[PDB]
């Protein structure tokens, strides 16, 4: 497991929803994306 690794996976998770990454923390297992779609 890893922290920065987690945010990259968050980034990808967000990208496969057409959204930008917004919020990421490994300790809280929270990855949040934007509401808006990529421009």
């Amino acid at each position: 497991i890893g922290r920065i690794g987690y945010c990259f996976d968050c980034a990808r998770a967000c990208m496969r929803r057409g959204k930008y990454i917004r919020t990421c923390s490994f300790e809280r297992k929270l990855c949040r994306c934007s509401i808006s779609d990529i421009k």
Binding site: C10, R32, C33
Partner: protein
């Protein structure tokens, strides 16, 4: 007016100055002479503003004396070393502008603190050490145009009442730890300049953040 020298002089003794001084606040002289450091007067007749900036005022302050200045409309105590919770500003009923930027005022401001301050137009509480929630009475200020509370230790949700503030044009709550979801009313509001950045856990309409954790 000379009579207005009495409350100011009392106020001068109720604070600890550690840089410069207020020796130009001489009891029995009209504070509107032009000789008083930091005094603004309306039409050069009656004291309407007090500006005691960068004097290293430290410890607790009391402002009660200032209620005897009928035309006092602005106070600026920016850039000092004030700490403790807010003094009795609410006794200064005609106050239009209150500036406390860059001090160490602390605690959670009691929700009803501002109820008696219906004339406030500008409120700067930024760069202090306020914690807990935004007091609900701030949202009830019918004349408020600007609120700056950036750089404190604030938490909890942002009250939706902000969206229904007729005169509000500037709302800076950045770099706190405000929480939960942003009320839609706030995003809806017409020509409002808002800044909610550096509140990590905020989600919703203005910060542009889906609330759902996708992990």
């Amino acid at each position: 007016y000379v009579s207005e020298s009495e409350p100011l002089v009392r106020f001068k003794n109720s604070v600890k100055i550690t840089k410069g001084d207020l020796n130009s606040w001489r009891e029995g002289t009209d504070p509107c002479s032009g000789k008083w450091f930091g005094i603004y007067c309306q039409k050069g007749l009656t004291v309407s503003g007090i500006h005691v900036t960068r004097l290293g005022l430290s410890g607790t302050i009391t402002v009660d004396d200032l209620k005897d200045l009928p035309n006092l409309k602005t106070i600026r105590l920016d850039n000092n070393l004030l700490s403790g919770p807010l003094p009795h500003f609410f006794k200064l009923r005609g106050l239009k502008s209150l500036m406390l930027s860059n001090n160490s005022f602390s605690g959670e401001i009691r929700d009803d603190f501002f109820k008696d301050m219906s004339k406030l137009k500008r409120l700067f509480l930024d760069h202090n050490k306020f914690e807990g929630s935004i007091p609900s009475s701030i949202t009830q200020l019918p004349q408020l145009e600007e609120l700056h509370m950036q750089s404190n230790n604030l938490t909890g949700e942002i009250p939706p009442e902000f969206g229904s503030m007729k005169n509000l044009k500037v709302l800076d709550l950045s770099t706190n730890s405000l929480d939960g979801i942003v009320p839609q009313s706030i995003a809806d509001k017409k020509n409002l300049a808002v800044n909610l950045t550096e509140n990590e856990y905020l989600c919703g309409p203005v910060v542009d953040v889906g609330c759902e954790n996708i992990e």
